[PDB]
Structures are given as C-alpha cells and as structure tokens.
Amino acid sequence: GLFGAIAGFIENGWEGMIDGWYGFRHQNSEGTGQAADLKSTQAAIDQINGKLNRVIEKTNEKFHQIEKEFSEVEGRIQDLEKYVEDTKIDLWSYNAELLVALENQHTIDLTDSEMNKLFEKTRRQLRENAEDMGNGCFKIYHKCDNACIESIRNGTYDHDVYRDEALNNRFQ
Amino acid sequence: GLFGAIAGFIENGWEGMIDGWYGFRHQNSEGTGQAADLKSTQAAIDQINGKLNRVIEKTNEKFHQIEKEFSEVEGRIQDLEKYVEDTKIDLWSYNAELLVALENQHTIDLTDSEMNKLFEKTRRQLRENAEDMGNGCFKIYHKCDNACIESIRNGTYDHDVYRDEALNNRFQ
Amino acid sequence: GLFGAIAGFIENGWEGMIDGWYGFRHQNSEGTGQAADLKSTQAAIDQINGKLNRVIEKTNEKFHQIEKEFSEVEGRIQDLEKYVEDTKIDLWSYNAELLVALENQHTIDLTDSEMNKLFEKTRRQLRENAEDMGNGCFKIYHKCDNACIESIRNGTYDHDVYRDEALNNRFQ
Amino acid sequence: STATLCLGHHAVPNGTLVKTITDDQIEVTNATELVQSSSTGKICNNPHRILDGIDCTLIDALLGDPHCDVFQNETWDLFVERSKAFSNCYP
Amino acid sequence: PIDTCISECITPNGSIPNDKPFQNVNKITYGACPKYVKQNTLKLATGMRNVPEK
Ligand SMILES: *[C@@H]1O[C@H](CO)[C@@H](O[C@@H]2O[C@H](CO)[C@@H](O)[C@H](O)[C@H]2NC(C)=O)[C@H](O)[C@H]1NC(C)=O
Ligand SMILES: *[C@@H]1O[C@H](CO)[C@@H](O)[C@H](O)[C@H]1NC(C)=O
Ligand SMILES: *[C@@H]1O[C@H](CO)[C@@H](O)[C@H](O)[C@H]1NC(C)=O
Ligand SMILES: *[C@@H]1O[C@H](CO)[C@@H](O)[C@H](O)[C@H]1NC(C)=O
Ligand SMILES: *[C@@H]1O[C@H](CO)[C@@H](O)[C@H](O)[C@H]1NC(C)=O
C-alpha cells in the first residue's frame, strides 16, 4: 500500500467484480454499467504468476547425505553432525521467512501500483473534461453515453471534441 | 526517497514539529498556525514498530554445541569444526548485513510514501479551490479561517461551498 | 516499473539521447531542440554506482580450509566434509540468486521513480500554464522561446508572468 | 484575500547515519543498534543452574580427584570450567 | 565471575542481554542467545530521512 490506492482513496473493493481484478463502474443517463480492465489485470497476474520460480528455480536433487538420527552417544563426530544439520535448518528457515515476507510486501505494493497506474492513465485520458472526486471516481462534465464510456475504457477517448462543453460545465 | 516528497519537493524538515511526524503549517488572515497529522504519523509508526520481529521472530535457544576454541592441533576433525563455525558465521553476517540494508531502504521508502500520501490526500480534498505551489505548500484561493483549516486537516473540507469564490479568484 | 513512467506513459526511449539518461525534447516556434537533465541522471547514477559494495563489502580472505576433493572412500568424516561443503555452496548460491534478483528489481524501480520524479517536478514548475498530454509530453499554452525552455529545464521557470496569457489560451 | 497551507515533516538537529541498499551512509532521525557488542563481565546464576568449578575440571570431578570431593553428585545446567583448574592425583 | 542476576544468554565474557537479534561478544554461547555476527555495529532506521533546516 505504498501508493494509497488500494485501502487508500479507493476505500472499498467490489465483490461483484468477477470479470477481472481492476475495472470500471460507470453511471450516466442511460444507466449504471460495470466492466473490467483486462490490461491491468493481465499485467498484475503476469507479474504474480511466477515470483517464486525466479528465486528458487526448482528443487535441487540430494541423494546421499550424513546421518541425522543417532541411537547411541558417540561424542565429537555426532556433535558435529548434529550441529551442521541444525545450522543448515536454521539458515534455511530464516531464508524461507525472509523470502516470503519480501515477496508478500512486493506483491501488495505491486497490486497497489497497478491500481494507481490505472487511475492515473484514466485521469490522463480525461485531460480537462473530468474532475477527480477524490474517492477514486471521476466526475465527467458532459453528455457521455455508453460509446463515450467504452472509449474511455478502450483508451481512445477523444478529449478534444468534448473540451468546450466540459469546460463550460465546469467553470460556468 | 522513491516518491520525491521527503528530500524532494518538501525540501526541508520542521524541527519545531514535536507533536508528530507529519503535519500542516497554515497561514491565513488570522495568523500562522501549526498542527500535526495524527493519522499519517500513526500509520508510519505502526509500520515501523515491528519490522524486525516479522523476520527474526526471536532468539532460538541453543544449549550444547561443538567446541569452537582448541588448544592443541589435531588435524581433520578440528579443521572441520573450524570450517563449519566459520561458514556459519559468514553466512549469518551476510544475512544481518542484507537484512539491515533492506529494512533501512524500505523504511525510507515507507516514510517518503506516507508524506506523499498525505500530500495527495490533501490535494484531493481541495479539488479546484487550491493550487499546488510546488514546494509542498498549497495556495488556497478563498477566505479560509481557522475553522476552514481545521476542516481541511480533519478530512471533512466542504469544497462545494467555496468553489465559486475560489474559481473566480483563480481564473478572474 | 512501479510508477508507470518508463515503459508506461512515456512509451518510448530516445536512442538519440547520449548526453544523459533523462532529458527533454522541446518544440516551439524557433524549432525542435533536445537537452539532457543532469541532476536526475546524476542522482540515478549515484544510487546505482555502488549497490553491491553496500551488502557484500568485499571478499573475505580464506587461507587454510578443509579438503574438498577425495581420492579414496573413508566413510563418516568424508561424508561430513562433503555435506558441509555442499551445504555452504547451496546456501551461498541461494544468497547470490536472491541478492541479484532484489538488486535488479530495486534498480528498475529506482530508475522508473527518477523518471516519474523528473516528470512531476516539471509539472509542478508549470503550475497552470501547461497541460499534461498524457504521453509524457507537456503542452505549454504561451509563446515559450528557447530562453523560456532553458528556464524550465533550469528550474527557475517564472510561471507568474505567463499566467494570464496561458489561462486565456486554455479556457478561452 | 487568500490562505496558505504548507505540509512538512519533523526533523532533528543531529541524526544517525544508517546504511541502505542505495547509500553507504544516509542520515535519519532515529536509529536503533542491532548488534549487542558489550558484556557485563559476570555470569548470571539464574535461570540456569550454573556450577562454578573451582580448580576442578569436569573430568577431574568425574573421576573423584581429592580436591574435587565437593563436586560429588553435583548437577548443572552450565558447568563453568576455570582456567586455573589443575590436576592433583595419579597422572 | 558468577553473579546474582537474571539473564538468558551466557558467553565466556559473561551474561549478555538478548533483546537485540545479533551479538558480537563471543561465538561461544549458551541459552537464548543472539546470533554471532562479524560486524560490531548495525544500525536499523526507526525514523524518516533527516533533512534539517539550512
Ligand atoms: C529513538 O527510539 C528509541 C526507541 O524508542 C528511543 O529510546 C528510548 O527513549 C525512551 C524515551 O522515554 C526511553 O524511555 C527508552 O528507555 C529508550 N530506549 C532505549 C533502548 O534507550 C529514542 O529516544 C528515540 N530517539 C529520539 C530522538 O526520539
Ligand atoms: C476499441 O479500440 C479498438 C482499437 O483502438 C477498436 O478496434 C475497437 O472497435 C474499440 N472498441 C471495442 C473493442 O469495443
Ligand atoms: C472533526 O471531524 C469529526 C467527525 O468528522 C467531528 O466530530 C469533529 O468535531 C471535527 N473537529 C475536530 C475534531 O476538531
Ligand atoms: C540557470 O540558473 C542559474 C541559477 O539559477 C543561472 O546562474 C544560469 O545562468 C541559468 N542558465 C543556464 C545555466 O543556462
Ligand atoms: C547532537 O547534536 C549536536 C549538535 O546539535 C552534535 O554536536 C552532536 O554530535 C550530536 N550527537 C550527540 C550524540 O550529541
């Protein structure tokens, strides 16, 4: 949550969203509609799908090792074997703990960043025609029908042809 | 300093700030005032308060180990014991170095992000009534008395009722 | 790529840029010009120049160790020596893999953040005189000659004296 | 006619130099030490059953050296073996 | 020398507090001890970047 989008200014998730991870809910004269953003969801999923194969490539293959369970008490050599195994176990347990903590932190920051990136991309499409209400939801200042909305979601929103009407609505 | 808030566009800390970590300094007709933001300070402190218990949970308990100091010279077994201990020491020293470096980097990025998040939250409260002067300080474009300022700090700033006066002051 | 500047809203690198890492391309009445930003490039280079001396300070100095290659087959002691060496090798290989992955991720995020920081600094210089076109390129709304542009790049852009003309050009 | 609202963060006169991924030395407001590098010089006798072996090694107390007679039937969590211990029985 | 006091970690140099996660006293330890590291100091930041006035 480094960017304050998720659990920040969005303030709420959408349990009704099953199409993807990030998406839009629009409301205009025609009526409320909902869609999912495939590009951001795919980017986040792609960055998450591995994330453990990129550090621990795979399981290495160990065949013959030392004895790790002993019946009698020998002394020096058994002490050394027990010490070596305990040291290895402690070091690998620490590696696991730290790796999982780092990966979880980065995953959370990554998804937050994807949400923020989608918000900023949308805000940059609506140059002057819309105002950010602050709850993660844009107020667009002109007649924007479903074709308009799907152009916003598409990334081909033509801001120039609504600029005059939007500016007149905003600043009166 | 990934967001450029601290040591970035804020450019200066406040040694006179002792109430919290992040806060506001306002100046209006009545006079200059200063306050601290409790929510951001508490969030940063909460994220920092642990940060070492979450990786190294605690100290594990070791009772009987190998000998690590030797009087005479035996040969193979003493060499192996010395090698095992030196290997463990080097690996744990590297773990300590890397862990501290990573935690420090993340702490710095975290506090920078909290500063940026406070700035963005404030900017989103003042939708069109204020302009970011760029030095981390907002110019509000209307009569904003101490009740107005404490509403900004509160998070209940009502932007709608100053919109006309502010817009008239900005764009003439 | 946590901020979406590089490979995000900039969308393209400049192979013609050899002066520095980050820079500006301006176009006005006089003609197209290009320059590099020394401050951001120097900051990124400074943060990258070390980045491996700060964790692995140097090479430690090892003189007499155990035997790691054996001719005959002894049994317990040779098994223990082989196990100790294999454990050390596996642990250090994991350390190398994780360290390189973390450093690469942070370097990419760092350079992306420097690009975003330069963009935001420039945007804050042009308070109301310019509009972000969204492709990482600003449309300035007034006569801005080469002295104007080099003032923008300098960081001493005087926004107040173009505010009226720019606002008139924007909102008509 | 207009108000002003600055944002800022607290600083301190003197700061502590820490080390990050991208800085050998970077100054912060506060920092805690993570390596315990000093000792009080004395062994606390709780919660561990310490057994100070005065002039007796563990093996000498085991065999039953005369000057180790006080160590018969002793138990310990940590046997502390002093450098001054010596043997005074059959070699 | 032995002392009348409470401590969970004993080194040949005496008892040490185990509140810190690492120690540089001795590699020979007994009890709930910190881990032995070669560094004599490791500072963990518990505050923000310090940018003072002027
Ligand atoms: C930095 O943080 C440490 C840890 O909280 C502070 O040290 C503590 O300060 C309180 C102040 O009342 C004392 O009661 C504790 O005994 C201190 N702990 C230790 C281990 O010394 C330190 O004061 C902080 N530094 C600043 C400048 O605030
Ligand atoms: C979205 O844009 C693409 C290309 O920009 C276009 O082919 C398509 O018809 C648009 N509308 C959709 C996919 O509904
Ligand atoms: C701040 O807001 C809360 C609730 O929004 C309100 O109860 C309080 O009176 C406000 N002013 C303060 C805390 O000074
Ligand atoms: C840039 O600014 C500096 C100081 O602000 C000034 O001395 C210099 O003449 C300016 N122009 C340049 C470096 O081209
Ligand atoms: C504290 O600050 C003073 C000056 O403000 C400085 O001389 C000193 O070195 C700093 N540190 C300590 C431990 O006093």
Author numbering:
A (entry chain F), B (entry chain D), C (entry chain B): 1 to 172
D (entry chain C): 9 to 99
E (entry chain C): 273 to 326
Text of the article:
HA is a transmembrane viral surface protein which is responsible for interacting with host cell receptors and mediating virus entry. Three HA1/HA2 heterodimers assemble to form a trimer spike protruding from the virus envelope, with the HA2 and the short N- and C-terminal fragments of HA1 forming membrane-proximal stem and the large middle fragment of HA1 forming the membrane-distal head. Triggered by the decrease in pH in late endosomes during virus entry, HA undergoes conformational changes that underlie its transition from a prefusion state to a postfusion state.
We obtained three major conformations of the HA-Fab complex at pH 5.2 (HA-Fab-pH 5.2 conformations A, B and C) through 3D classifications and refinements. The structures of the three major conformations were determined at resolutions of 3.0 Å, 4.2 Å and 3.4 Å, respectively. The HA-Fab-pH 5.2 conformation A has a highly similar structure to that of HA-Fab-pH 7.8 with an r.m.s.d of 0.3 Å between the 1470 aligned Cα atom pairs of the HAs. The small r.m.s.d values (pH 5.2 conformation A and pH 7.8: 0.25 Å; pH 5.2 conformation B and pH 7.8: 0.53 Å; pH 5.2 conformation C and pH 7.8: 0.36 Å) between the HA1 heads of different conformations indicated that the globular HA1 heads of the HA-Fab-pH 5.2 conformations B and C also remained unchanged, as expected. In our research, we used a neutralizing antibody, F005-126, to bind the HA head and found that the HA head remains tightly packed upon low pH treatment, indicating that this antibody prevents the dilation of HA head even after an incubation of 30 minutes at room temperature.
